[PDB]
């Protein structure tokens, strides 16, 4: 029988080979990486089928491989917990990563080192699988830092470009801040509960106190901000787009960003008992949703706009998760639908960039609808899913999240619902702007660009991603199949129904329509300008990512450099200064004493006659003085 850990072994081993075989595997390495990803997908599907063939607690698969860190009371044993929640992430990650690998075959076909790129992709998939499968928070941390490393490597690909290297470094550092927060969380968990595994943690979760649980939840939320790119750690997404488009697709659709939401939901027991932590998570989700929606409207680059949209969607998912069990299942469903349609959108954007001679500016593109019919269709399907057309997948998930936010009740519920509605409207506006500037209007192409249809290898993944963006949302929402599936592990909940569901759906549709009409008037009725138009202070602020980078450069880069200079000065002048002063004192005293060696025999005789000092000392020894 196939053990669960194969899911991790198949990709990682592939990566290992692709990393060690080197040039010998450069000709066929991508094939091996794709095969490893596909095998992981097959194993995940088989495990999901086995879980379906089981009922109740038998659905989840818990498997402890070996004792890992048996130090005193820690006794952490490496183990995987493929539960109803874990299997959904496993399937999403494996399928989307396999599709992205297939797409990368063609996307990286003309670029050397494709074998190394696929090695990094396989390592990324293995890290994500370990993150979602680990039955304890220490294995979760292992997968977490592995995902961080893989994101650094992939974003850092094309190392000859300084921007790519800087983006990789920034991504890893921001991820590592959240990792440090999660490390504080684990230390608190061990100190208070004495255990790190999910089972023991959640068994002891009811104890401790509101303050301790809130601290744990807040640190986990910081970690998620690190991964999920929530404020204030949301600044690294924009620069990460310097990497290959498949990297952006994989990061935003699954694994990297999905990790924060997975951490929040898997930690559901803690947040349920920590209302203050849930409030913090909700605030972060709403704020980052609004910030990403605002930033996206200004980005003139397809990659940057897609990154802002991903940030906004992750914010919506985070708000749903922080809403407690009422939104946890809806959060997971929206995460899956986002994986699908965001991956489709990123693949379409990569196809456009490849056709546009790697052009990334949305202003240069235009009227591509006829130029790339397959890419246009895939991008439009993902666009409909993201906007949330009733047939599209995103419609059901976003509607459920908004309904939960509104049903949170009171001032908090009203604020969350208003934030969600504004986010939906801004998302519609930004996505419509991007789509119109890309596929509609005059060509605006430059440098004699000659767009061509993407090959079948990059195309089939696009069609499958569009099919997912069309179907998965309904397939999961209609009848509450996903909600019932997550019920046994995720906290069950009833419906408050603060407002009629049809009312919320109509409001969402009206907001989306208003945004679409505004975007059409701005960029469809009015020809798309070829240059960045001026605008209100808000427009430039969004163009600068709401100064999010500048703040980081203003506070931490500058403050960090100040602290570094201060410490270097302390080392060179204070710490080393004490030893230098000691040496100077010794040398000065040595010179002074050497001056006593006058060289005159009579001076030496005087020093000897100083033996009067010895005489007086001996005499006074009895004088008691």
């Amino acid at each position: 029988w196939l053990p669960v850990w194969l899911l991790i072994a198949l990709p990682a081993a592939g990566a290992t080979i692709l990393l060690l075989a080197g040039r010998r595997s450069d000709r066929w390495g991508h094939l091996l990486g794709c095969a490893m990803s596909l095998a992981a997908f097959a194993v995940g599907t088989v495990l999901f089928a086995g879980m379906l063939g089981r009922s109740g607690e038998e659905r989840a698969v818990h498997e402890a491989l070996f004792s890992w860190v048996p130090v005193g009371g820690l006794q952490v044993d490496f183990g995987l917990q493929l539960d109803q929640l874990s299997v959904c992430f496993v399937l999403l990650i494996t399928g989307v990563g396999s599709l992205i690998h297939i797409y990368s075959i063609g996307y990286m076909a003309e670029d050397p080192d494709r074998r190394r790129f696929f090695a990094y992709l396989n390592l990324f998939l293995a890290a994500m699988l370990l993150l979602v499968l680990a039955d304890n928070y220490l294995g979760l941390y292992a997968g977490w830092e592995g995902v961080g490393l893989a994101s650094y490597l992939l974003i850092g690909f094309w190392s000859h470009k300084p921007s790519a290297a800087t983006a990789a470094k920034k991504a890893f550092v921001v991820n590592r801040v959240g990792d440090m927060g999660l490390a504080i969380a684990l230390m608190i968990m061990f100190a208070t509960i004495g255990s790190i595994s999910f089972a023991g943690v959640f068994a002891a979760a009811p104890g401790l106190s509101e303050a301790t649980l809130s601290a744990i939840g807040l640190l986990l939320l910081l970690g998620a901000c690190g991964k999920s790119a929530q404020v204030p750690l949301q600044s690294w997404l924009g620069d990460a787009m310097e990497g290959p488009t498949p990297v952006s697709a994989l990061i935003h659709a699954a694994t990297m960003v999905t990790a924060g939401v997975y951490l929040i939901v898997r930690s559901g027991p803690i947040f349920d008992l920590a209302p203050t932590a849930q409030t913090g998570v909700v605030i972060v989700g709403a704020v980052t949703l609004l910030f990403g929606a605002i930033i996206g409207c200004a980005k003139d680059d397809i990659k940057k706009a897609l990154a802002a949209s991903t940030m906004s969607q992750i914010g919506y998912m985070v708000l749903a998760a922080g809403l407690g069990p009422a939104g946890y299942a809806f959060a997971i469903m929206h995460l899956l639908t986002h994986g699908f349609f965001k991956a489709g959108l990123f693949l379409g954007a990569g196809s456009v960039m490849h056709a546009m001679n790697d052009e990334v500016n949305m202003r240069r593109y235009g009227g591509l609808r006829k130029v790339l019919p397959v890419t246009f269709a895939t991008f439009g399907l993902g666009y409909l899913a993201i906007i949330g057309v009733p047939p599209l997948a995103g419609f059901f998930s976003k509607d459920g999240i908004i309904e939960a936010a509104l049903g949170a009740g009171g001032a908090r519920g009203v604020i969350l619902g208003g934030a969600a509605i504004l986010g939906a409207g801004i998302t519609a506006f930004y996505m419509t702007r991007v789509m119109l500037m890309t596929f509609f209007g005059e060509k605006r192409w430059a440098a004699n660009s000659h767009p061509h249809e993407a090959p079948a290898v990059m195309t089939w993944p696009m069609i499958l991603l569009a099919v997912g963006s069309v179907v998965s949302g309904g397939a999961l929402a209609i009848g509450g199949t996903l909600s019932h599936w997550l019920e046994p592990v995720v906290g069950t909940h009833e419906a408050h129904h603060a407002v009629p569901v049809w009312v919320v759906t109509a409001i969402v549709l009206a907001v989306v329509a208003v945004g679409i009409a505004v975007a059409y008037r701005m960029y469809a009725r009015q020809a798309v300008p070829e240059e960045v138009p001026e605008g209100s202070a808000l427009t430039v602020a969004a163009r600068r990512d709401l100064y999010g980078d500048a703040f980081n450069e203003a506070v931490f880069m500058r403050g960090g450099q100040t602290l570094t200079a201060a410490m270097v000065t302390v080392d060179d002048k204070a710490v080393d200064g004490t030893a230098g002063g000691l040496a100077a004192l010794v040398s000065r005293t040595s010179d002074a004493l050497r001056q006593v060696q006058t060289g005159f025999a009579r001076s030496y005789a005087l020093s000897m006659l100083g033996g009067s000092a010895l005489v007086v000392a001996a005499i006074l020894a009895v004088q008691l003085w």
């Binding site: 009371g73 650094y152 000859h160 230390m187 270097v568 080392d571």
Partner: protein, 516 residues
Amino acid sequence: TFPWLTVLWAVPVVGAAVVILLPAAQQVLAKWLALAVSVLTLAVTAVVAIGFDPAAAQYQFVESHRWIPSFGTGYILGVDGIALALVVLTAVLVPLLIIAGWNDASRQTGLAGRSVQAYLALTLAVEGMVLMSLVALDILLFYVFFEAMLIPMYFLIGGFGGENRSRAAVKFLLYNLFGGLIMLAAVIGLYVVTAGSDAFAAGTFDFREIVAAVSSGEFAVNPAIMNFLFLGFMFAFAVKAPLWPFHRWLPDAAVEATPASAVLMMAVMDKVGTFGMLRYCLQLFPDASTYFRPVVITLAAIGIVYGAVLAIGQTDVMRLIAYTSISHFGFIILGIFVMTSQGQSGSTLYMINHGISTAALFLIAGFLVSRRGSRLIDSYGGVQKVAPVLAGTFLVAGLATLSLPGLAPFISEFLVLIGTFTRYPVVAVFAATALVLSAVYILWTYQRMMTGPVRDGIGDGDRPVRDLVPRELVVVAPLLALLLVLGIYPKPALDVINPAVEHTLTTIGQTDPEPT
């Protein structure tokens, strides 16, 4: 029973003597003989470890003989889990350093042509003295070799090494020797106190006897005298293991010495300091160590953060690595002095992992520096394009020093941090900031050196940066393999470390705090 530890520590010294006695014309044969001696020492260490039973008595392979009864010191060897870990580290590393420094002594002239023989003999002598210090179960014997090991390393830095080698060697030897002399004051005080106590027949240096006497309570001593003795021991070990602010000697010696010698210093030699804290400071003076725990914990945390910041601020690659190592010793001492099973086991495993990781990173940086002619970080750029393997191995080593979970150091750092939090949460958080600072000073250096457009003269010119030669791969691959193995499956190390740590904590009346 065969005197396994005696052979273990004697073989390096005898091999050094033979190597230095070889004629000048046998330089290559001298290198091979030194490597063979190192491999024989590694085999001896392997058999000792295999025969070592972690479930058995605390000390094993014990050899005991009368050496200087007049001083109350005996030739007593014996290896515990803590000692065995460092012994294995030293034994495995020394051959790798030898094959790394294969040609480091080639350009040195004079010395009757014994430059290669002298370098190899000094390295082997350092290995032997470090090993005997690790296995010694007598305070005076351990002090003798803890201080003696400085001289071979002092020669190894001053001889060979960079232009400023002389000043660096002087600063090294004088810092460490001032500390060792303070240890001598403390050791003589310990002898005097033991002589004045009825617990022993006379002034004694048998570590086991003194530890048992203090633990049982028979050897009660005035807490002020114990505090002073502990202060002397801790000061000596703090200069040896670069505890902040006593670190200032380490950067110059590490940068000026050859990469193999610098690694031997920081990776292997300096560990004897931290190990010294773990075996003696805590067990000879449990009361004084407990009393001073706040101060030493604060110093270790400040060392972590301060060394990380300085490494961020450095412009020389090798000096950056040296400050990284200073911060890592900060972690080691923090884990040692928190007096927690998790903390101490993590600190020992960290000694191991840091030895390996610093060896790998420093040796790779040394290879790169040799390829070019400058240690300046800004002097490089886009090195990944020209030497993919060199850049990849450097990245892996940095990730190890960065404490990724997939690599060994994280397991230790985590374990240390965990242990620190259960007793000093604020100190734990302050140290945890080093997780971010390490990402900074590793990845920024990687960005500055290996990424971006290929800097002039790196891929072309008279001194292009060619990829690693097979010998450098022989050096690097084992270190990366150990990092990966101890990251994925650290248990084999912990199984040895955990018992010894428990015996240590049991000895000092300390226990892991019960969870809330």
